[PDB]
A and B are shown apart, each in its own frame.
Chain A
C-alpha cells in the first residue's frame, strides 16, 4: 500500500527553497526546483559564499566528474567548518536524492541561521532548537492564553506569530482582534506584517501552517528568521 509523499515534505521543500532564494538573490541567483538546481554545485557554493561572506573555489566543467568536484567543494567547506554531514556523499547531491538534499539544506540552515540564537539564562547543553523554543516562550510570556510547547501544533492558529511581532512593535498588531480571528486570517496577517514591516521573507503560506501537525523544520526556520529580525 502506497500513498502520496507527505504534505510536510512538500512544505519543507517550499520553505527551504524560499529560504535559499532569499540569500541567492544577493548574488543575483535563483533556484526553481530544489531537487534539481543544486545538483551542479554552483548554487551551493554561491549560497555558502553569501552566508559566510567567504570566497570558495569552483571547478568550472560541464560533465559529471565536474559536478561531483563542485559539490565536494561545498561539502568540504562545511566539514572544515566543523559541520557534521553524516551519511551524505557528493554524488547524492549531484544526482539529486531529494531527501538527502533536503537534509543538506537543513544542515546549512541550522549552522548559519538557527545555531546563533542567544537567550537570557541559557545553557551550552541546550540545543539551538531548545534555545529558540525558550526564546519563543519568553516572547509570548504574559499574553493571555498563549502558550508555546512545540514548533508544530503550537503555531497552528497564528496567535504566537502575532504576539511575537507585537512584543517587538505593539503598533503593528491589534492583539484584541487576533483573539477573534480565524487561524488563516491570523497567519496571513502575521506573515504579511513581518514581511512589509520587518523585512522577514514569507517562507510559509497560511494554508500550510493551519493543519493539525505542521512541518517542524519549516516553522523553526521561520521563527528563527523572526528572531533574526529582532535585537
Chain B
C-alpha cells in the first residue's frame, strides 16, 4: 500500500477535528491516524483506528494547533504515512479571570486588578467589570455599574468616587471569540481594611 493522499483537516464544533484523506490504490482494510499537539514530539502522539477514509478527533483542547498524519494498512501490513496536515480547533469561552486584587488608594478610591483566565480557550479580546453597593447579607441593592475594557492587555482598573465604609461587590469576566466566560467575584469594604494589595 502507498500513502493515503490529499490529507485534509478542518475544525468541527467543540474540541474536535474532522480529518479525511484519499485512500491509496488497492483495497486497504483500514487506516491509522497519528495526531498530536503542534510543538510536542511524535512521542506524545495519540493513535486512532479507522475502517473508513475519515476520522473524528475528539476530546481536544480548545483553540489549539494540532498536527496529524495517517497511514493505511491491509494484507501486507502498514504502508507509509501521508504528509503532515495542521489544523486548529475552535474556541471556547474562557475560565474565570484570576482572583481580584485591590490597592486601596483612599476611602473612596481603589485600584482593582486581576490575572488572565487560567484557561483562555482562545484569544481574549475584552474584560467586563461590574461593581455595585451590597448590603449586610452581601447581595446587591441596586443596578451594578458595568465597565467594558476593550484592551485585554489592560487588567487593572482605577475606580474612584466610591462611598465611605460601604461594601461593594466586584466581578470581572473575560471574552474571546466564543463569547463570555464565568465571573470572578469579591466583596470589599475600603473603610474596613497602605499600598499593599488586598485579596478576599
Partner of A6, one of B99, B118, B154, B158: B158
Interface of B is mostly: loop
Considering the complex, give the chain A residue whose CB is closest to the CB of B101: A99
Binds A, one of B5-13, B16-24, B77-85, B107-115: B107-115
CB pair A1–B160 under 8 Å, yes or no, is: yes
CB pair B111–A2 under 8 Å, yes or no, is: no
Partner of A97, one of B39, B115, B157, B159: B115
CB pair B111–A6 under 8 Å, yes or no, is: yes
The CA of A230 and the CA of B43, in the complex, are separated in Å by 55
Q: List B23-76 residues whose CB lies under 8 Å from chain A.
A: 39-40
Q: List B182-200 residues whose CB lies under 8 Å from chain A.
A: 196-197, 199
A4 contacts chain B at the CB level, 8 A cutoff = yes
The CA of A194 and the CA of B153, in the complex, are separated in Å by 34
> Across the interface, which residues of B come within 8 angstroms of A91, CB to CB?
98, 115, 118
Considering the complex, give the chain B residue whose CB is closest to the CB of A4: B158
CB pair B98–A92 under 8 Å, yes or no, is: yes
CB pair A33–B155 under 8 Å, yes or no, is: no
> Across the interface, which residues of A come within 8 angstroms of B99, CB to CB?
92, 97
Would you give the shortest CB distance from A171 to chain B, in whole angstroms? 40
> Across the interface, which residues of A come within 8 angstroms of B125, CB to CB?
none
A141 contacts chain B at the CB level, 8 A cutoff = no
Given contacts A5-B111, A33-B153, A99-B101, contact A87 B199 (CB under 8 A): yes
> Across the interface, which residues of A come within 8 angstroms of B116, CB to CB?
95-96
B178 contacts chain A at the CB level, 8 A cutoff = no
Considering the complex, give the chain B residue whose CB is closest to the CB of A99: B113
> Across the interface, which residues of B come within 8 angstroms of A191, CB to CB?
none
CB pair A97–B118 under 8 Å, yes or no, is: no
Given contacts A91-B118, A95-B118, contact A2 B147 (CB under 8 A): yes
The CA of A64 and the CA of B115, in the complex, are separated in Å by 14
> Across the interface, which residues of A come within 8 angstroms of B154, CB to CB?
5
> Across the interface, which residues of B come within 8 angstroms of A1, CB to CB?
159-161
The CA of A62 and the CA of B39, in the complex, are separated in Å by 8
Interface of A is mostly: loop
Partner of B155, one of A3, A35, A87: A35
CB pair A98–B159 under 8 Å, yes or no, is: no
> Across the interface, which residues of B come within 8 angstroms of A86, CB to CB?
196
CB pair A95–B117 under 8 Å, yes or no, is: yes
* Interface size of A in residues (CB-CB distance below 8 Å): 23
Considering the complex, give the chain B residue whose CB is closest to the CB of A93: B115
The CA of A62 and the CA of B154, in the complex, are separated in Å by 24
CB pair B39–A99 under 8 Å, yes or no, is: no
The CA of A1 and the CA of B111, in the complex, are separated in Å by 12
Partner of B153, one of A35, A62, A95: A35
A130 contacts chain B at the CB level, 8 A cutoff = no
> Across the interface, which residues of B come within 8 angstroms of A96, CB to CB?
98, 115-116, 155
A100 contacts chain B at the CB level, 8 A cutoff = yes
The CA of A9 and the CA of B197, in the complex, are separated in Å by 14
CB pair B197–A99 under 8 Å, yes or no, is: yes
CB pair B113–A98 under 8 Å, yes or no, is: yes
> Across the interface, which residues of A come within 8 angstroms of B166, CB to CB?
none
Would you give the shortest CB distance from A34 to chain B, in whole angstroms? 11
CB pair A2–B159 under 8 Å, yes or no, is: yes
10 closest A-B pairs (Cβ-Cβ)?
A95-B115, A1-B161, A97-B115, A99-B113, A95-B98, A5-B156, A98-B156, A3-B158, A96-B116, A95-B116
Give residues in B with beta carbon < 8 Å to A.
39-40, 98-99, 101, 103, 105, 111, 113-119, 147, 153-161, 196-197, 199
A-B pairs with beta carbons under 8 Å apart, 22 shown: A2-B157, A2-B158, A2-B160, A3-B158, A4-B158, A5-B154, A6-B158, A9-B111, A35-B153, A62-B40, A64-B118, A64-B119, A91-B98, A95-B98, A95-B117, A95-B118, A96-B155, A97-B98, A97-B99, A100-B101, A100-B115, A100-B197
